[PDB]
Amino acid sequence: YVKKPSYKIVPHFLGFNIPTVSKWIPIFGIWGAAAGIGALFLIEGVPRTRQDILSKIPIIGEHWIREIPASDNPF
Amino acid sequence: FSTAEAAGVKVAAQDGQSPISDLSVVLRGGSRYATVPGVSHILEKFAFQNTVPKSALRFVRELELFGGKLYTHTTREHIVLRTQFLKQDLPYFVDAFANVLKETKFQQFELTERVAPVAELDLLKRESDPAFTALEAAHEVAFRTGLGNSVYAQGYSPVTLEDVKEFARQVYAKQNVAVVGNNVVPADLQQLVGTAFADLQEGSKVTQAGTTTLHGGEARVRTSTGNALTIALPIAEPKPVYHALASFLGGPASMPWSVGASPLAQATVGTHTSVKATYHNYGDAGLFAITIKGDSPAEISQVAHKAVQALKDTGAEVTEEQAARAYAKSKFAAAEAFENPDSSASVIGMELLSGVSRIAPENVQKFTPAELSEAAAQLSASAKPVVAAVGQVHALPFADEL
CATH class of the missing domain: 3.30.830.10 (Metalloenzyme, LuxS/M16 peptidase-like)
Incomplete structure (x- = not known):
């Protein structure tokens, strides 16, 4: 015979609890990647982005190593 | 159904071979005993509202964890409150009925917002059938009062919180309460009712004001x-x-x-x-x-x-x-x-x-x-x-x- 139902209250805040949030942790990850890729793509033209990030990527990085010949540069 | 007595309360139970038990509290509180028109319907709808130990909300949420169900109805003779659950969960249901009979907080907001609107929808659904109306009308003509009282609460004559509280003071008493257990071990029920309903008032038998008179x-x-x-x-x-x-x-x-x-x-x-x-x-x-x-x-x-x-x-x-x-x-x-x-x-x-x-x-x-x-x-x-x-x-x- 059962006298009482068996349960606990899980900690919660602003209507979030850890079981639920834990399911969304990976989604925040992917959105973070999406925002990272997007941001980097937006500033791909900035010379510092190329110098410090993009030209350092292996294989692919040579796409961003481009020199103007000294004969063709007024400045 | 082996009839017995547990702490002044009449208890009848019949054991069976099923995983499903039905526990019903039958109250001598149907409409023939109604102090004011519609009070027995309102009291029925006030069952499993807020009690002092357990809120209506908490009760419903816990009932869902046991997968139990709740059924209530009013007749001319009785109010019946029935729960259906798995056999093992009997102690919980006994204690819930005890809380309802001993410790219901009859709060005005429950009457206005919860109880009365539900009672009104109950009646409107019944009256959708014109045969229900005709048979109700017939009892009213035939008996006038007592058996001729309406079973259900009607809008023309409003029930107040004081009306319901007074009626419940009469009805929720050891003299007006019977416990009926289908597929419940009779010895186990007597032990539980004997502990849970021990502090319920004894009260007195509710009676019909006046003798039954017949009329055409x-x-x-x-x-x-x-x-x-x-x-x-x-x-x-x-x-x-x-x-x-x-x-x-x-x-x-x-x-x-x-x-x-x-x-x-x-x-x-x-x-x-x-x-x-x-x-x-x-x-x-x-x-x-x-x-x-x-x-x-x-x-x-x-x-x-x-x-x-x-x-x-x-x-x-x-x-x-x-x-x-x-x-x-x-x-x-x-x-x-x-x-x-x-x-x-x-x-x-x-x-x-x-x-x-x-x-x-x-x-x-x-x-x-x-x-x-x-x-x-x-x-x-x-x-x-x-x-x-x-x-x-x-x-x-x-x-x-x-």
Whole structure:
């Protein structure tokens, strides 16, 4: 015979609890990647982005190593 | 159902072989005892509201964890509160009923926002059927007060929180409470009720203000939502033969797509109308009713004439075949009523709260053609016929026409 139902209250805040949030942790990850890729793509033209990030990527990085010949540069 | 007593409370239980138990508290608090019109309906709807140990919210959330269900209804005689659960969860349900009877906080906001609106939807759903209305109207004409009180709360006469609190002070007392357990081990229930309902007031037996008086008459409830007609005959001496007569006269078909072989069923041929004879025993008076619903007032009128003729014809002569058919249909009706949890609970509730021993379906008396015809004769020759017409009342019959 059962006298009482068996349960606990899980900690919660602003209507979030850890079981639920834990399911969304990976989604925040992917959105973070999406925002990272997007941001980097937006500033791909900035010379510092190329110098410090993009030209350092292996294989692919040579796409961003481009020199103007000294004969063709007024400045 | 082994009847016993636990701490002043009458407890009846029957063990079975099922995972499902039904526990019902039957209260002597139906409408015949209602202090003010509609209070017994409101009290029924106030069950499992906020108690001091446990809120209505907490109760419902925990009930869902046990997968239990809750059923409540009000009759002229009782309020029935039933729970259905798994066998093992019995202690929880006993304790829940104890909280309701001992510790209900009857709060004004519950009445205004929760209880009264639900009671109003309950009634409106019932009245969608014009036959319900007609049979209710018929009891009101026949008895006026007591059995003639409305079962349900109506808008014209409002129930107040003080009305409900006073009635509950009377009803929720050891003298007005019976516990009925279907598929509950009887020894286990007695032990639990004995601990849980020990501090319930003793109180006193609730009584009907005034003696039951019988009256004839007419009620003409003009609605726009369907047509019906009840022909009732108030009975001063309730006798078990009227069960047999109700089942004999019959009305509903025992077979799909058929009319039926019962006299009242045969009265409906050529019409889209239905009929049903019923007998209501209330201990000290009874009501024998024949209700006809349909879409056509002309057809209802036509059937109504045939129905009263059928009753007169029965008063003349019944065959042996017909008397045996009555015994069979009546034993069956008794059996299925003792099976149905809603009606079952009230049957044992009546045995426990009054002292009217239940008639087992296997002990239903066989009435001879003489006894049946004699019963029908008394009804055909009643001094106090009641007729309740619902719908296009200008087109429905009157008592003096029948």
